[PDB]
Scaffold this active site. Sequence first.
Site, PDB file in Angstrom:
ATOM      1  N   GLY A  51       0.620  -1.156   0.087  1.00  0.00           N
ATOM      2  CA  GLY A  51      -0.038   0.119  -0.089  1.00  0.00           C
ATOM      3  C   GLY A  51       0.865   1.358  -0.022  1.00  0.00           C
ATOM      4  N   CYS A  71       3.800  -0.617  -6.769  1.00  0.00           N
ATOM      5  CA  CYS A  71       3.672   0.273  -5.801  1.00  0.00           C
ATOM      6  C   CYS A  71       4.743   0.439  -4.652  1.00  0.00           C
ATOM      7  CB  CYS A  71       2.529   0.230  -4.981  1.00  0.00           C
ATOM      8  SG  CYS A  71       0.921   1.032  -5.801  1.00  0.00           S
ATOM      9  N   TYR A  72       4.477  -0.018  -3.614  1.00  0.00           N
ATOM     10  CA  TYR A  72       5.548  -0.088  -2.736  1.00  0.00           C
ATOM     11  C   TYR A  72       6.602  -0.813  -3.067  1.00  0.00           C
ATOM     12  CZ  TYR A  72       7.793  -0.356   2.095  1.00  0.00           C
ATOM     13  OH  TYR A  72       8.624  -0.362   3.134  1.00  0.00           O
ATOM     14  N   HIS A 150      -2.041  -0.096  -9.733  1.00  0.00           N
ATOM     15  CA  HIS A 150      -2.055  -1.524  -9.394  1.00  0.00           C
ATOM     16  C   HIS A 150      -2.575  -2.265 -10.825  1.00  0.00           C
ATOM     17  CE1 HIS A 150      -1.420  -1.623  -5.299  1.00  0.00           C
ATOM     18  NE2 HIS A 150      -1.545  -0.521  -5.281  1.00  0.00           N
ATOM     19  N   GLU A 152      -3.370  -5.205 -11.054  1.00  0.00           N
ATOM     20  CA  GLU A 152      -4.103  -6.424 -10.535  1.00  0.00           C
ATOM     21  C   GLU A 152      -5.591  -6.243 -10.471  1.00  0.00           C
ATOM     22  OE1 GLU A 152      -1.952  -4.505  -8.754  1.00  0.00           O
ATOM     23  OE2 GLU A 152      -2.379  -4.815  -6.878  1.00  0.00           O
ATOM     24  N   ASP A 208     -20.245 -30.161  -3.874  1.00  0.00           N
ATOM     25  CA  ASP A 208     -18.682 -30.365  -3.347  1.00  0.00           C
ATOM     26  C   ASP A 208     -18.925 -31.951  -3.378  1.00  0.00           C
ATOM     27  OD1 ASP A 208     -18.557 -27.784  -3.440  1.00  0.00           O
ATOM     28  OD2 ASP A 208     -18.938 -27.572  -1.174  1.00  0.00           O
ATOM     29  N   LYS A 366     -14.454 -22.522  -5.126  1.00  0.00           N
ATOM     30  CA  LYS A 366     -15.813 -22.891  -5.479  1.00  0.00           C
ATOM     31  C   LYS A 366     -16.136 -22.960  -6.943  1.00  0.00           C
ATOM     32  CE  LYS A 366     -19.669 -24.230  -3.625  1.00  0.00           C
ATOM     33  NZ  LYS A 366     -20.860 -24.580  -4.323  1.00  0.00           N
TER      34      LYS A 366
END
Lengths: 643, 658
Positions: A51, A71-72, A150, A152, A208, A366
């Site tokens: 961040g 970023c960082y 970012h 992402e 599942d 899922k």
Amino acid sequence: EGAVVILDAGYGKVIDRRVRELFVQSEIFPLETPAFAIKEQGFRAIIISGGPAPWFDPAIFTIGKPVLGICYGMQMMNKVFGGTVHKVFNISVDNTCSLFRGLQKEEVVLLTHGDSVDKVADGFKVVARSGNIVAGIANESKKLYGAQFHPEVGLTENGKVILKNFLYDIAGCSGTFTVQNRELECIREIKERVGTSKVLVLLSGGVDSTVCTALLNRALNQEQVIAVHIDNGFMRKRESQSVEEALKKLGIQVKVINAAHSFYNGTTTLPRISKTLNMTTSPEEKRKIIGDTFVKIANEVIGEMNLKPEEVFLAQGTLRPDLIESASLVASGKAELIKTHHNDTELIRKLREEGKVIEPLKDFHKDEVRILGRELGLPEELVSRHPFPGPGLAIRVICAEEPYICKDFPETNNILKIVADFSASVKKPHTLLQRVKACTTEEDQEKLMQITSLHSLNAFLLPIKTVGVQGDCRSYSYVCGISSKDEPDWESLIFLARLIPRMCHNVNRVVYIFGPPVKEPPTDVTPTFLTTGVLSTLRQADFEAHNILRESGYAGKISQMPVILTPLHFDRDPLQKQPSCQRSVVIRTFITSDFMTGIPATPGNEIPVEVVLKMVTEIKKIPGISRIMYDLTSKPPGTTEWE
Amino acid sequence: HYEGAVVILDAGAQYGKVIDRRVRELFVQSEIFPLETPAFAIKEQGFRAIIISGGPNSVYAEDAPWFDPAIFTIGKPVLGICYGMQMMNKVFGGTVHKKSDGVFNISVDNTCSLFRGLQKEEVVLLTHGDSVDKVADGFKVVARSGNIVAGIANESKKLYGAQFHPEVGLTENGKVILKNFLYDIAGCSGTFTVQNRELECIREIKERVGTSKVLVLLSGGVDSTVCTALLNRALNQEQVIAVHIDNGFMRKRESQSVEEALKKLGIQVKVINAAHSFYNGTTTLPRISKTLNMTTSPEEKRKIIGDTFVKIANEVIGEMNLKPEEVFLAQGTLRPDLIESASLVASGKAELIKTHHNDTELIRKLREEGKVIEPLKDFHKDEVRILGRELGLPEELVSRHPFPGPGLAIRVICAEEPYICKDFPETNNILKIVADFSASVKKPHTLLQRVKACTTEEDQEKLMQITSLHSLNAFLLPIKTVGVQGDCRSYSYVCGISSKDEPDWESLIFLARLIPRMCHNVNRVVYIFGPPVKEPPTDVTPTFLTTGVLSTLRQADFEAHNILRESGYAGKISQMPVILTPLHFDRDPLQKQPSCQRSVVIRTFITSDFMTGIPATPGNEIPVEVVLKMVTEIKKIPGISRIMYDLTSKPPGTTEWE
Ligand SMILES: O=c1[nH]c(=O)c2[nH+]cn([C@@H]3O[C@H](COP(=O)(O)O)[C@@H](O)[C@H]3O)c2[nH]1
Ligand SMILES: O=c1[nH]c(=O)c2[nH+]cn([C@@H]3O[C@H](COP(=O)(O)O)[C@@H](O)[C@H]3O)c2[nH]1
């Protein structure tokens, strides 16, 4: 080894998801991970984010692996190479830089507030700019890349292209981390763990459990996998049969235990001795009885199968398995039954303590389980089903002998009459109108003015208990009903549905009742318990609503839709003294990401009015049905289920 | 009655509230109305303009909600957003394409009134629905995304449509757009400020209250304090009766510095020193409870405190001979309710007076007669602080974190016996393996196999690194703490972690999330500062809500908070419970020394709404060195064994430990 390590200083999960969606394996490590540890494991590249200073090994930049600093991470990269600092946008990008090939000179990116490069580290070049603020740096020969934004997130429109350039072009990842290949690795690990032992699976009929069963059968010999379905008598119409049929089609046979009678007549010790299930009203008691009964039956059935017990595994379809479950959680919702401690469950206890419980699906999300099921040959209809709770329809019948009426009942109804008739009620002010005024916002009051003048509504409490969440706690309290003289305006109802619980914290749910106005809401109940006739009525109701939803193309637009039966018989002349015999059906649409919060489906919005009305039309025909209702409550204060 | 004001017609439930927030940030009064509101009602109400919104849904849907198309023709400016633009174009005879939502860079016509002050290229959140084919007659296309019509305008009738949402921050210059509409186009003056809302609110208090007295129960929190200052500013000195009941569980001298700040502004506060009344307070069980200073159960603590408070409040009104028939009670509550949930009372924040108590007749009558008012109900949290400043309250006072009703009472883990169940040894063996994972993997046994079977490949990998780089111990502490799992509250174990080396905070935080996933009988994971804890205690220091225990925690709380405040990061965390635990570490087990010291937990918390949240990671939202100073300082307090740092997020944790 063909994978990429993510080091986060805070985004890790998000990068992890994007890298996975691009078919490359991605492990997240803590920032302090040493470079020799990354070299030893054979990762192809490193992604570093964070961040807006923590201990890291600067060798992560020096060991000759491609590195992407977001970023960082970009700041660390710059600092390590000498550079300094000072002090949603359309930025400029150099599309000759390896990270940015195939982009426009101009890109929409999410830029976060914080530091910004001054002296650009030696050997590095600026490759992105937002005004003067350096937005990207690069050393091509060392394959180190920094981005201030970012990539992402989806808010960075071409972020997927950037990540692709990093993983494939620069790092040389081949894109083989797919569900298909992970499935084959998963099969190999199953072969390795189990060897020649038998594997028992407790197949509940859910998605599942069925994929797990199909996966186990695919990994092992036909004779090694024993699928056991214990039918608790609370399953939906025909959906046990179709799971058996689908598994049968794939050469998998399922042993069915018809245990309905033992659940209906189920009884257990309470944290004292419970009533039989078919005479219980308490939702907590229902869950314990069903939980305790299932495990006693499972334990016995395992006993009956004459297996060498040191060569047996037990497999579950759980995605997030635990070592130890809490009984608190069993008592209130979803939980791993075999992971809690019980009486008369020795075989299960031994399997658990011997490390013979396996969860093959634990490494799958899922959505991946669905793709896995398609690959194993299960029908799309089957793998796309909504979740269905263990205790099934047992928690979908409000059981009662007596009306739920507390001392707050009369006052709350008076409050509600004012709310529903607000614009008229303002023209004849009394004490209680002033209290309503003193507790509602000017904006809410003004919106209420309009709503209640545009429509004639009634609002009233129903004498039944429903579950709801108030702060950190589950609570059992009133349902409020709304009816109208003309067609319902949905958005206005949704508004009342939020407003009322805010005013009256003793109200857990607001539902809309279909048809003519309810002039005299019942103050009594139809006696109701988990009996075979009642369950039969609900099964038909649930079946119709779900078929109508599915046939309409809108089944995928809602996360879940409990259909509930309530002990309410409407429209009896009170001066006729006729007893309460009929019951009423609730449609509870639910839309959610995580089942912690969620909203109903607004008809006209996420689901068509016509679809909803057709449900109402059909269910009304079912013998014994008084009214149909539509749950308008969000979570909170609502919950997905009614108990 | 709404001149200078704007009306928002929301076809859905999502964008109405966002547009309302944005408009209010622009200092214009905003009202949300139903889509089906008739034009003539809007006309007669006096609104200056109309904003219409809703989502991607078609206006040609057989479902399409009803609206009065004359809303577009009453001569007031209209801004239609997405669904609104689609409505607008349809009404004036336009059409939509037969065929068929990210953030794009689009082109915009500079000369259209809606877009003055903007560059041609603009970044907007484009929605995905129906798109304009035939632009309605009298409209000109004023924004484009490729071939897609993204904006339309009819300048002479002041009607504007946009296919994006200018009310979201992700439309970079959406604020400019809304500004053009409210100011340049609709001619709002921007009179709807906190300052003018305060003046209006004052007028309303005078009107409802007349010469009647207004009592306010000053808790000491910001809302209570702002409310008190507000009422004083609206009425005479003689009309406002502010009573502060000290419950005995407040922090170091903050019921003085709130009395002092108010007195300096000419506000007198009657202080009731009722500490001892609370300490020895008692209530009926939901049978008589124990006394507060002998209770271990947090439900009982809350009910005792809650019941005692209302009883004394009622007693104070009685001794002042204030008739409910000629008096008011005011609360600083932001979100008041007519009826309070009895569950919420017993478990957390609640309006105590909006529930039935026994023997509180005067308070009952005040509620029943409609004499409970909530001045602050029309302000949001951020505005409360502005209002407090404008009322002359000090910045350090309007800036305070929330502090619960029962204060320190729920921040002392009270115990006579260690908390230990049948699962205790099993859970400790699991934790031993987790802490020692890479070494345990080297010598595998049955229990290790259980751990691999329940952990993801990724978590095992991550856990291999962590437990080879540091030598860590993990173990249960024999105490109870509240936690929320799924829908329900739970009281269960705290897990402790110590290390030979300096703490790696992100690793500890990972461990803090992992352990509760594996062991649902664990509600919290804390880092214990100092040398390794070799032999965890299986005994507890007996501990109750007694004056010396309170004196100790009050001191620990003070130091912790002072360090936090003097370092500048106070505003970076939402709330910092400091908790006293009945735990004595570092006693040589082969010596039988009794448990007599206690341990302190720092619980940093960061949240938007208190439904979910995270701890501050030292070295992240808060400097490592600040946390270490609390450790150094708090350790000096007599009777303090170890310091601990809460690593748990909500869920499975909560803000408070009880
Ligand atoms: O296996 C289960 N056993 C239970 O006792 C249970 N109770 C609720 N649910 C399901 O969990 C999700 C959340 O439900 P609530 O919003 O009502 O808590 C929804 O998907 C519910 O269907 C259960 N599943
Ligand atoms: O007035 C109050 N009386 C209470 O009994 C109570 N319990 C918790 N809190 C505060 O509420 C917020 C939520 O904290 P939890 O995560 O512990 O529920 C946090 O801000 C807590 O400080 C209380 N406030």
